[PDB]
């Protein structure tokens, strides 16, 4: 929210992720990241716990061990967020 934006301004230093609700946040990351820590990035921007998420690229449910490069994601790779149950 406001905090996420303000914190970025002071960072020493683009992809989209959509939900079935209509809205979709846009994250900034480097493809070295795993799945686990990107869930945290969502925890930060929108206040959703990392447990409470399923991440899906190319219609395939994504694994924690692998990285973004290991699942061939690129700049502006559209991702999909649906709640865990």
């Amino acid at each position: 929210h406001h905090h996420h934006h303000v914190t970025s301004l002071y960072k020493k230093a683009q992809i989209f992720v959509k939900t079935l609700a209509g809205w979709g946040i846009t994250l900034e990351v480097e493809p070295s990241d795993t799945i686990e820590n990107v869930k945290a990035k969502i925890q930060d921007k929108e206040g959703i716990p990392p447990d409470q998420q399923r991440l899906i690229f190319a219609g395939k449910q994504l694994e924690d061990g692998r990285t973004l490069s290991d699942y061939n994601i690129r700049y502006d790779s559209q991702l999909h967020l649906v709640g865990r149950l």
Partner: protein
């Protein structure tokens, strides 16, 4: 109009349980209502346990008004159950606020079906305890609950431009468009065709077989891919409400039976209110009256609505839709020593001209508490 006699008979036919504890206990955290409500409720093998007076307590909060805390729960859980974020439900389209069972819910969550049953139980609970779920669903949903057919007509209210596309085909020659018996669907970025019948990809749509085309597209849009989910829902719902008892309502009534808003919008209420015998929108006493209604909570507002109209049913859409047809009225009767009184017959409040806001607040609140007896 006959709904009043129907709803009376309905509740009179709804049998009380005589083998079940005095209260259904729920110990939930607001942060995790869905999880917490789901575990507790799907734990209970006998549905009847859920008919006990709902004793709900959030985050340790002790000794609050039982029927008011229920009100909150039904709202908050409805907010979570139906959140399209989860993929059980979804919006009928983009630029639509109404809801429908998501066909791909099982792709989203592998245990979608027990969650559907759960929602059914929670919905049947709402009914059983004369409370409502906060949900805008498409009429098809309510039709399917009565095992009633779906039609081309039904698509209009849901999607007009798509309805028009099929209406066009009904009235015109489709040869132009080189269509097949397939519908393409996008899910998680990927696109997929779906054959409407066996080998539908090879079958051209023509004048000779377009009425079949239209029919099949409807079933695919609304029925075929949500049978398992809707079944589950219906199972849970009928665990609490006998299906024979629900049969007396139609699809319109059945939205009024189980859906509605958990708070009365005040602007809407004020918009559709008449005044008699000196009172007027900018009259001082009327100014104070609405100040009160504004500064109530939803529970106090609904108790007031019952006091004056004789119901607690918030329809959605309008206070215009409030049946002869009679809207809310506020008339001057009596003196400040008299408490105000209502006439559910006329949807009318008789309000004496009080000295202050606080007098009006107190005298009114007492009068409502006098009907709680």
């Amino acid at each position: 109009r006959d709904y009043k006699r129907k709803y009376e008979f309905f509740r009179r036919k709804l049998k009380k349980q005589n083998d079940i504890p005095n209260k259904f206990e729920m110990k939930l955290r607001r942060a995790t209502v869905l999880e917490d409500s789901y575990r507790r409720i799907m734990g209970v093998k006998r549905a009847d346990f859920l008919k006990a007076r709902l004793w709900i307590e959030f985050d340790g909060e002790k000794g609050l008004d039982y029927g008011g805390v229920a009100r909150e729960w039904f709202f908050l859980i409805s907010k979570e159950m139906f959140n399209p974020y989860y993929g059980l439900f979804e919006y009928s389209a983009t630029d639509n606020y109404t809801l429908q069972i998501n066909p791909n819910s099982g792709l989203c969550n592998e245990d979608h079906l027990s969650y559907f049953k759960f929602i059914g139980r929670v919905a049947g609970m709402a009914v059983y305890h004369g409370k409502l779920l906060d949900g805008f669903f498409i009429r098809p949903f309510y039709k399917m609950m009565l095992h009633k057919p779906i039609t081309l007509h039904d698509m209009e209210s849901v999607d007009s431009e798509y309805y028009n596309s099929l209406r066009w085909i009904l009235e015109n020659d489709p040869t132009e468009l080189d269509l097949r018996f397939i519908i393409d669907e996008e899910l998680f970025g990927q696109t997929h065709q779906h054959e409407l019948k066996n080998g539908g990809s090879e079958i051209v749509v023509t004048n000779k077989n377009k009425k079949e085309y239209i029919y099949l597209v409807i079933q695919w849009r609304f029925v075929n891919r949500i049978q398992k989910q809707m079944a589950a829902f219906k199972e849970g719902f009928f665990e609490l409400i006998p299906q024979d008892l629900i049969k007396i309502f139609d699809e319109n009534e059945l939205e009024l039976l189980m859906c509605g808003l958990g708070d009365v919008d005040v602007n809407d209420w004020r918009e559709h209110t008449k005044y008699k015998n000196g009172y007027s929108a900018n009259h001082q006493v009327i100014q104070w009256f609405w100040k009160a209604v504004l500064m109530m909570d939803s529970e106090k507002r609904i108790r007031l609505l019952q006091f004056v109209t004789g119901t607690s049913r918030v329809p959605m859409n309008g206070f215009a839709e409030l049946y002869g047809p009679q809207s809310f009225t506020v008339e001057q009767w009596g003196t400040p020593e008299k408490l105000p009184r209502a006439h559910t017959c006329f949807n009318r409040l008789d309000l004496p001209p009080y000295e202050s806001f606080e007098e009006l607040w107190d005298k009114l609140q007492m009068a409502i508490e006098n009907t709680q007896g």
